[model samples]
Target: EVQWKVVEESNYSYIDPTQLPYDHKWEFPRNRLSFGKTLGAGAFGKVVEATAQGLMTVAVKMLKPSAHSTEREALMSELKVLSYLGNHENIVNLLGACTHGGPTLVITEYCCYGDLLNFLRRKRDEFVPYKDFLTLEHLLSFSYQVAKGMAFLASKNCIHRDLAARNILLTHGNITKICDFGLARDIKNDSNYVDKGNARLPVKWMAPESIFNSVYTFESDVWSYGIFLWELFSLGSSPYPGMPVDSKFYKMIKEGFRMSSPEYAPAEMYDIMKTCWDADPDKRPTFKQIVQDIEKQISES
Candidate 1:
């Protein structure tokens, strides 16, 4: 549906593949890749289904040509982040890239099921996977997977500044892979990242410090994951349902206001969610601890 050709017309500086942090062998020739149907598109780039050397099906994320170095830098940064994280079952795998005198291309494995947000939207309509009639057990399984993925990110000192369900990917067999690293930051060199200006954010999914002070840390990621749990139980209902997008509770969240438990959400699950939303970031449980608790819950159930 996106006019990708028209969208790709913007001009940007061509980056040399040698400038990339990765080795030269990872760069693929433009001719070796054949693009297919558009998978998704945004202001900056579009992801399309593509074949690599006629051997493999992959997703190609191509940034629209831009005159600004900032745009190119963002794509390069995402590539670096994915490269550093490497391959993890719960994280999307970066296959390779094509950065030779064309739009910046980042190749990653394709997820047949797409993103978690749209997936849950269909589930709420009792479509697709939901027609099989999912149970709370199934939702728990998804939540546990997300927690496991976050645990991996935390282990690497990576902060997924944006941790909403929309940024999470799903594949066949209910496998969840955390994606969209454009806002991710390394915490090894710094404990937190402070936004520089009036940057927009997924406010409803953000923690108090992130919304008010523009700070992001691992604990803030945990806060977003707690909201993710709510999304799963509510079948993709928006956070702060019934409240206007610019509601006064924007500040109320800092004052201890929290979303009430989703209907029929188990008390144990709600308790974990509450702990994740604790007023003090220090009080929030680590992703590793959360994973352990979720496993315990599953075993007990």
Candidate 2:
């Protein structure tokens, strides 16, 4: 009964080119980018710490030598997606690309803290509940920033099918930037369930509809955003806390067994997360609403 497909939720959206400061070519010279040590590697490619134009430190994610055209084209189109996104303070913006210089490579701003997943784990390890109280702690601050950015994506009709703490990166200044906007997908650990053949789905962060019917929408993103909030509140514990991606987990979720909020999660924040996981997708809160909720907390706190 495998009668499903990736719902081509291909909505066309654009940003006014005039709004951006520079309009130069989105291409970079390969020689200009000095590749450093490999940040990490996988079955298909690796992201290297790099420097561009002898000045800026960036990250280069590229396919391996002798790649298939479809894979290369996906990275090329990823370039297109970044431009469509224009520039969001919370988005990991594209620096440039090197489609012609060598294998298709996407150049992006490097986050000093790397992905949010293990970064928070480090915090958990250090016993750092130490919110300055003088300022918003990264815990609250990160969630606020992400909701703001997701609001921007929703406004643009861009559905980030993979929105998780791991998918987003953090700046040294504690800014949150959303990354992996569908141009790249096969970037997760082996624990995820395989869907529609080779497609490795982040079943943990996915909406029930996405896992079952293969239908994803902005609402689906809201659902993942909720799961990501769990990651934030729990300091990056696996969602559902050891719940396997098997029929039992699915059936429990289908039968209304939502995960409990972490004790550390402020009640108000948990309330916001609650709205996001509503069984009826249409009833879920929009990212803008979530943004406002977090903003009010930030202001009042």
Candidate 3:
């Protein structure tokens, strides 16, 4: 175990698990150009709207080597996870990637409509001319997109540790695509595994087990789906944004108080949210089942 760890850490940068003996050809050629403007950025690096070899708009995520405790491990994990993911419409398209000496670069299809976080925030005020915010179609579409992504992830034995609106991207037709593999973990048969330190969690959307005991099973992902539903109904606001971290745990543990979608959040949606946010993670609904319920709701609504 120690030897494998040392080798993986040592060659993390120059190698791709999906492709052996990776060379400069696998990366974005320095001579190639970027066309689109800056989309967004995080601690790793900025994502720019760029035209790749196909001339299609792509979201190019550039990773900062300095940010990772082990750059090679980070890149390998991301590449391994994405490589196995064949193109699913709901899943973000991973076109290709590049690895140079400085930072790791990944090229992907650009969702022009931006991520769900930006989408909802754009509709926040009356000043924003978008009237689609209050509509039922918008909410259903968003929820269904999440459900589809969850179903796919569950099937693949993958867990999106950071499932949130911000990480969920969209295209022009309200077409949803899940992106940001930074916190994704492939559980496979290792159900008992847990991260060494604090997981890169979107705590607002986390399950109680994920919060209290660091358990991140498929059931925990379902709990997050419930929170996603709430966000769909309540615009972009987090379920319990104002509450302190300690308060969130205290209320959750002592009072059996998981976040309830706000009253303005539709009752039916709240019910769906509750189905997944059950105190026992094992009691949560499966994403496949959630899809069936959501589909019925859409038909009636």
Candidate 4:
């Protein structure tokens, strides 16, 4: 067995298992892991603070003990995507997982700041001066990082069916990583999977094609990215806030209605957002192009 050594870092650090001679993915022993209080909970499982091999701190997503094949399939789906996508700095790094049966545990690198939605929401309650807190440039950087990550996924022909602010995590240096691939699907399997009944979706963030016709494509994800941009600029404001969540919502979007630019949103940023929300999915910018546009905006200013 190759003994792993921890690298020195002021705040956060990670060991690149691929860099080592031995492959460590899915080889983590659950017996060596000790769990802490729950960090968050959802339908499939709960994420908790945990120590791996008594050395590295990590987040452990523990599947519900009674989870059946469907739930297990969802968990495995995320694992498969993460494995194939490999490691990108802007995508959550899956360290290891326990496949030894009952209540499967998926281990991943821990992010101190949590998800972007809550991170941005808390900024309002901080005692720090507004200038000292997150600035507009910082917000722009967040969107750029997210776009970069999405571009990498797009390059791999992967479509993140659920792309939203809540699915993005922030680290110590405000670094963003896209997570939650439970809904991710490859372009190869690009059939109308959503039509397969009872499939839950984030309605507000989805493109019209995806919502109405159960069609998901890279372009559809781009549309969601536009909504994500709105979320970031609005500092976590709900999409279509106070709007009735029904057929009316669908009717509004179908009629070419879109959310107005968030207050204080620059004309350039809002213009890009509108391009992303274009009714014709084919007209939406590619993720690579979005990244270039975001960087261009950043460089121009």
What clash count goes with each model? 2, 0, 1, 0
lDDT of 2 by residue, 256-292 (tens): 7788997578889899888898989999999888888
Clashing pairs in 4: none
Against the hidden reference, what TM-scores do the models get?
A: 0.83, 0.86, 0.77, 0.81
Question: Worst ten-residue run, lDDT, model 3?
Answer: 1-10
Clashing residue pairs in candidate 3, if any? 12-72
- Stretches of candidate 1 exceeding 4 Å from the true structure: 1-20, 125-131, 181-197
* TM-score for candidate 4, residues paired by index: 0.81
Best-performing candidate as measured by TM-score: 2
Error of 4 at 83 (Å): 1.0
- Alpha carbon deviation, residue 260, candidate 3 (Å): 3.8
Q: How well does candidate 2 match the true structure, expressed as C-alpha RMSD?
A: 4.9
RMSD of 4: 9.8
Provide the lDDT at 110 for model 1: 89
Residue 151 displacement (Å), model 1: 1.1
List the global CA lDDT of all models.
0.74, 0.75, 0.65, 0.74
How many clashing residue pairs are found in candidate 2?
0
Cα lDDT tens digits, model 1, 1-301, are 1000001112322223224376555687888888899887656567889989843889888766542677677677667667766678888888888777677788898888988987888877563323276677778788899999888877765667778787788998889888873422222232122222444456678889977776677788899999998888888888888775454766588689999998747888899899999989999999999899999988987
Better of 1 and 3 by lDDT: 1
